[PDB]
């Protein structure tokens, strides 16, 4: 499927506004499980429940364990670019 590059803008006091599931220990990609209403992912658009997050800000998430992806994602700030594919 198409790999989309999706922009999200975040203030430091905000979260991304997504929940993630999956990861290497489960044999699946990092997958978006929820978009939270009114938070940056919802406001900015472009992300979809069931999307695999292949990368964020150029950092590859394809073979990351869940907690590793949580760390990387949680450390991104400001103008953030996701690369996602719906699965």
């Amino acid at each position: 499927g198409p790999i989309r590059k999706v922009l999200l803008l975040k203030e430091d006091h905000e979260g991304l506004g997504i929940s993630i599931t999956g990861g290497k220990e489960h044999g699946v990609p990092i997958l978006i499980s929820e978009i939270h209403p009114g938070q940056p992912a919802d406001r900015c658009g472009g992300l979809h429940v069931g999307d695999a997050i292949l990368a964020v800000n150029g950092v590859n998430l394809r073979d990351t364990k869940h907690k590793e992806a949580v760390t990387i994602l949680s450390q991104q700030r400001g103008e953030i670019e996701f690369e996602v594919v719906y699965v």
């Binding site: 506004g17 939270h36 907690k67």
Partner: peptide, 7 residues
């Protein structure tokens, strides 16, 4: 069986 984390 999967973890789920809000970010």
């Amino acid at each position: 069986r999967w973890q789920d984390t809000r970010l």
